[PDB]
Design an enzyme around this catalytic site. Structure first.
Site, PDB file in Angstrom:
ATOM      1  N   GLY A   9      -6.910   6.085   4.261  1.00 56.03           N
ATOM      2  CA  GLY A   9      -8.344   6.312   4.378  1.00 56.03           C
ATOM      3  C   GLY A   9      -9.036   6.612   3.072  1.00 56.03           C
ATOM      4  N   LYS A  11     -10.104   5.997  -1.047  1.00 55.00           N
ATOM      5  CA  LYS A  11     -10.406   4.850  -1.886  1.00 55.00           C
ATOM      6  C   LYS A  11      -9.854   5.039  -3.295  1.00 55.00           C
ATOM      7  CE  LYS A  11     -13.473   2.150   0.234  1.00 55.00           C
ATOM      8  NZ  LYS A  11     -13.383   0.671   0.101  1.00 55.00           N
ATOM      9  N   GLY A  18      -3.745   3.967 -18.287  1.00 59.08           N
ATOM     10  CA  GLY A  18      -2.323   4.203 -18.491  1.00 59.08           C
ATOM     11  C   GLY A  18      -2.052   5.252 -19.568  1.00 59.08           C
ATOM     12  N   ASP A  43      -3.188   7.168 -14.582  1.00 64.33           N
ATOM     13  CA  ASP A  43      -1.798   6.944 -14.209  1.00 64.33           C
ATOM     14  C   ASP A  43      -0.867   7.779 -15.103  1.00 64.33           C
ATOM     15  OD1 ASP A  43       0.221   5.276 -12.632  1.00 64.33           O
ATOM     16  OD2 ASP A  43       0.939   5.092 -14.744  1.00 64.33           O
ATOM     17  N   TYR A  48       6.790  10.677 -19.031  1.00 62.83           N
ATOM     18  CA  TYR A  48       5.932  10.366 -20.160  1.00 62.83           C
ATOM     19  C   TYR A  48       5.732  11.561 -21.088  1.00 62.83           C
ATOM     20  CZ  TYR A  48       4.646   6.230 -17.243  1.00 62.83           C
ATOM     21  OH  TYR A  48       4.678   5.084 -16.466  1.00 62.83           O
ATOM     22  N   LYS A  77       4.385  10.254 -10.787  1.00 62.97           N
ATOM     23  CA  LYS A  77       5.616   9.665 -10.285  1.00 62.97           C
ATOM     24  C   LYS A  77       6.812  10.601 -10.434  1.00 62.97           C
ATOM     25  CE  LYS A  77       3.585   5.672 -12.599  1.00 62.97           C
ATOM     26  NZ  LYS A  77       3.172   6.230 -13.910  1.00 62.97           N
ATOM     27  N   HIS A 110       9.262   6.631  -8.881  1.00 63.28           N
ATOM     28  CA  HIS A 110       8.989   5.871 -10.101  1.00 63.28           C
ATOM     29  C   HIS A 110       9.822   4.590 -10.195  1.00 63.28           C
ATOM     30  CE1 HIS A 110       7.790   6.706 -14.524  1.00 63.28           C
ATOM     31  NE2 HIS A 110       7.808   5.396 -14.340  1.00 63.28           N
TER      32      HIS A 110
END
Ligand SMILES: NC(=O)c1ccc[n+]([C@@H]2O[C@H](COP(=O)([O-])OP(=O)(O)OC[C@H]3O[C@@H](n4cnc5c(N)ncnc54)[C@H](OP(=O)(O)O)[C@@H]3O)[C@@H](O)[C@H]2O)c1
Ligand SMILES: O=C(O)COc1cc(Cl)ccc1C(=O)NCc1cccc([N+](=O)[O-])c1
Length: 315
Positions: A9, A11, A18, A43, A48, A77, A110
């Site tokens: 539901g 958006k 990135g 993201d 990272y 992730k 991931h």
């Protein structure tokens, strides 16, 4: 339209920023400038090792009254060494603390490959092989589902799953949440037609990663193909009075994909968002699709023996 409807539901904005390889010493500014020029999707990933600095930028702009939390779409992730069900909550809560958020809009497995738990992100044996963990996709999925039911994450999904691995989840007896998103590598040299068709036909939204070919990937070889320098793409770009990057970002957008180009350069961050003012033609689209070579930026030789290595399958 700027956002795509997920199966929960909510958006999701189709253009995101990135942050892989965005150095901590430079990513806070990247995220500030990105929010200033209109990005709302970021993201992230624990691996990272910059989530804290991402968090700093977001908190800053919330405090400056530039954006509201509800307007942001933050993705992270679960890394490979945390697939044991007893480890998942903890991994998610570490990311939340680092990002200084009380929820994530989307949390992804991931990679389907679980690795030996410990501090090392890529545990290896004496001979260089990644040491797997005794975990499996369904049990890991189950633990992701608990995160929803606890309110830590609004949606869950997967990344780098082949269609068979997606199907295992879909067909799981007792499934609580279907995956919302499958985030995969996708660009003119790896166009992913069969897996996009599969995912879209199952109501799973696809996110394209490395849309510019990840020229900064740390394992690049000089003889590798280079999208941003492809003369044929430059020519499609020149015709529209746009840059090659801008074409490479618009391309997945016209395939009903989400796309997440990475930059820490403020001019490029703004440039990369300027893709809602033009359309690639039918010819441009099929031309770009014809450049497929099944070439992957992201594929680990030292994982090819893992039971769950995803790229042995055709798709
Ligand atoms: N799920 C996963 O397995 C996975 C794997 C890979 C990537 N991803 C995600 O996808 C995001 C994007 O992929 P990526 O980081 O591999 O690479 P990418 O977005 O394809 O390319 C990033 C490279 O392009 C350069 N660049 C950006 N905009 C440019 C422009 N307008 N003109 C010229 N050069 C430009 C960047 O330089 P500067 O930054 O120096 O400006 C950086 O070197 C990642 O950051 C990560 O969030 C997910
Ligand atoms: O994964 C990403 O998001 C980007 O790639 C990164 C990023 C960091 Cl910080 C470190 C290492 C990698 C990389 O080697 N990922 C590729 C990879 C990993 C695991 C398994 C596989 N696999 O193929 O089974 C491939």
């Amino acid at each position: 339209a700027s956002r795509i409807l997920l199966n929960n539901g909510a958006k999701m904005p189709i253009l995101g920023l990135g942050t892989w390889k965005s150095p901590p010493g430079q990513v806070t500014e990247a995220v500030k400038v990105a929010i200033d020029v209109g990005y709302r999707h970021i993201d992230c990933a624990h691996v990272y090792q910059n989530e804290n600095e991402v968090g700093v930028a977001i908190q800053e702009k919330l405090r400056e009254q530039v954006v509201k939390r509800e307007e942001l779409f933050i993705v992270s992730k679960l890394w490979c060494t945390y697939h044991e069900k007893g480890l998942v909550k903890g991994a998610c809560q570490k990311t939340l603390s680092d990002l200084k958020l009380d929820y994530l809009d989307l949390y992804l497995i991931h990679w389907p490959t679980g690795f030996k738990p410990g501090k090392e992100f890529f545990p290896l044996d004496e001979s260089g092989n990644v040491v797997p963990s005794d975990t499996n996709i369904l049990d890991t999925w189950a633990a992701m589902e608990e995160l929803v039911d606890e309110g830590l994450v609004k949606a869950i999904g997967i990344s780098n799953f082949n269609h068979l691995q997606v199907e295992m989840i879909l067909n799981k007896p007792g499934l609580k949440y279907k995956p919302a998103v499958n985030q995969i590598e996708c660009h003119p040299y790896l166009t992913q037609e069969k897996l996009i068709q599969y995912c879209q036909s199952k109501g799973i939204v696809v996110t394209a990663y490395s849309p510019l070919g990840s020229p900064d990937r740390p394992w690049a070889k000089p003889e590798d193909p280079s999208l941003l320098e492809d003369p044929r793409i430059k020519a499609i770009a020149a015709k529209h009075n746009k840059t090659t990057a801008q074409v490479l970002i618009r391309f997945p957008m016209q395939r009903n994909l989400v796309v997440i180009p990475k930059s820490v350069t403020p001019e490029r961050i703004a440039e990369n968002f300027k893709v809602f003012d033009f359309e690639l033609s039918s010819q441009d689209m099929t031309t770009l699709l014809s450049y497929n070579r099944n070439w992957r930026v992201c594929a680990l030789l030292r994982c090819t023996s893992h039971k769950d290595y995803p790229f042995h399958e055709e798709f």
